[PDB]
């Protein structure tokens, strides 16, 4: 997610110009607290997500 976010952030910006992302099996391997850790990191990275 970090690599994707920075990659999508154009020059002169730190946030992904293409804000939307898809996440299949979003959390099919983690418990809700750790999934929420992903939520925090993902969202904090300037990412609109599905």
């Amino acid at each position: 997610t970090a690599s994707l976010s920075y990659a999508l952030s154009p020059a002169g910006s730190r946030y992904p110009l293409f804000g939307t992302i898809i996440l299949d099996e979003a959390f099919s391997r983690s418990s809700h607290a750790v999934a929420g850790r992903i939520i925090a990191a993902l969202r904090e990275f300037g990412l609109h997500a599905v």
Partner: protein, 49 residues
Amino acid sequence: IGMAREAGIEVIDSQREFAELSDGEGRRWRFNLPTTGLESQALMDIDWE
């Protein structure tokens, strides 16, 4: 049990102690449990997400 272990409230388990409780749709059941006791201080000190 997970909160007890995460915060630090330790759990002992060699015992047969029982309870009787019902699930979401009224169907009732009998339970067997391990030995331990939860406390507010350890849980409020530790964080949750």
